[PDB]
A paper describes a structure:
GalNAc-T isoforms contain an N-terminal catalytic domain adopting a GT-A fold and a unique C-terminal lectin domain, classified as a carbohydrate-binding module (CBM) 13 in the CAZy database, with a β-trefoil fold that are connected through a short flexible linker.
Despite the co-crystallization experiments were performed with GalNAc-T2, UDP and Mn+2, we obtained binary complexes with glycopeptides MUC5AC-Cys13 and MUC5AC-3-13 (the binary complexes are referred to the enzyme complexed to the different glycopeptides MUC5AC-Cys13 and MUC5AC-3-13, respectively), and a ternary complex with MUC5AC-13 (the ternary complex is referred to the enzyme bound to UDP and the glycopeptide MUC5AC-13). Interestingly, MUC5AC-13 was bound to an active form of GalNAc-T2, whereas MUC5AC-Cys13 and MUC5AC-3-13 were unpredictably trapped bound to the inactive form of GalNAc-T2. MUC5AC-13 as well as MUC5AC-Cys13 and MUC5AC-3-13 glycopeptides have a C-terminal GalNAc moiety that establishes interactions with the lectin domain-binding site. Although the N-terminal of MUC5AC-13 is covered by the flexible loop, the N-termini of MUC5AC-Cys13 and MUC5AC-3-13 are exposed to the solvent and inserted into the sugar nucleotide-binding site. The latter two glycopeptides adopt very similar binding modes, although some differences stand out towards the N-terminus (RMSD of 0.72 Å for aligned Cα atoms corresponding to residues Gly1-Ser5).
Author numbering:
A (entry chain A): 75 to 569
B (entry chain P): 1 to 15
The structure:
Amino acid sequence: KVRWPDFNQEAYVGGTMVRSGQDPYARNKFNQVESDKLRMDRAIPDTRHDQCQRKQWRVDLPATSVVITFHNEARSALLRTVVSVLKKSPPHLIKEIILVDDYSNDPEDGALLGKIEKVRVLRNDRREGLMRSRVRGADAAQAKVLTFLDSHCECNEHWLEPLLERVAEDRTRVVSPIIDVINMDNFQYVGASADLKGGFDWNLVFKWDYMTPEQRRSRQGNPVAPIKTPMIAGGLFVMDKFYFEELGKYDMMMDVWGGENLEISFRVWQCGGSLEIIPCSRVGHVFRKQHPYTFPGGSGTVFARNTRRAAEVWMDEYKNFYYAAVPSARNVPYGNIQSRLELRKKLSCKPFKWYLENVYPELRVPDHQDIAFGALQQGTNCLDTLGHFADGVVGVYECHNAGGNQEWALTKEKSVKHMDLCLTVVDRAPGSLIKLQGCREDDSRQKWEQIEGNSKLRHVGSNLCLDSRTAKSGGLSVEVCGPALSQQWKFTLNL
Amino acid sequence: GTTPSPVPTTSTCSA
Ligand SMILES: *[C@H]1O[C@H](CO)[C@H](O)[C@H](O)[C@H]1NC(C)=O
């Protein structure tokens, strides 16, 4: 058994260093060369608000079992995660660190770390996935409070106490830190916007949401108050162990791919708990995507088993908006869900409509008689008002997934509508720019239709199609329909 | 492992 300061980092990282000529990003989608240059206990800046430094905690806060699942992690990053926990946490609050090695190619990545004080290693004999692995770690846990971390994190100053203090006060709170960013290229540790929290669109993939004006006003008035959130962000949360068990742990029929925070966030909120972000708790994390998952695309299928298991149990009739967004999922097998249905019945949970109204009212729900909804996409761009009002041109702009000027519907009256403005064919000559004008129910100039498997938008009663070829020249136009890239448009939801 | 995720940002202009 070795105390973490005596652990031989250079021998552990060892023969796994990147050779010259090898892709530094190959092991786990971040730059391993730079990860390997850091020490295991490298200093990081204290990104907490100044008020957080004036907080004191009882010595009798409940200890936690920290459960870290991993699969083919970069050794330097896995070791720095473990050391961060040990270095930054009051030792008495760390009952144990349980590493659950989810069938990594080399079992030494984990086994060598089991020499460290407090570190226990459980190795799965096949790839089970994060959710099943977390259940294994949780069943093995000795403490009364579970802490789940991912395998490429770095805990900051007094990260743990604020989380435990919330759960010790009310066992129904499931709580997370603010996630700071560890850059995937250069490994610098920095803070992100304080006005971002976890969310999702009807495709049910995680996204960052920008707080509304009310929420931002509220945050300004106390930047260290706990923040309620509709969806856990990241790999990271603390939960009373008995509450985790009572609520149904994780669904053990989930597989490797996607959905890790979806089912649990719905279940916690619907079945009477809550999700919080705790600003005085900071943990940095290496995010590995540069862009959102593309939809349409293959991800909708890759994530469908786990996503359907969430939607079919929890979402009631709202699952239909998910299938509107991800029609490729509609027929993907997802296994029997009777026991999870039984759990929901046993726990007396609220309907999804209640979740939408009380927990996530910012998720906008299509009108009952909308034909299509969401954003109107063309490649990675979206139909956009460019901030214009009546008589202004419309445009196209990089899809930002933030709603706003990119929020549209195709209404029962066949209009393409944003707030009370509608796309209007003010001039039928081919080439002419279209304009935003007030929606009027019987204006033939404002009628559009999806054509060709919902891949274009034609002006009803015409051979004119919406066309971005004029976007450099002033905005979108009507153009003679033809086989042009600039005439491809598709709503994210087809109802 | 976790499901790879985007770095925390949003649109850089306002609605
Ligand atoms: C920000 O403004 C630009 C135009 O300058 C776009 O309209 C973009 O869609 C806007 N962002 C949001 C969130 O509506």
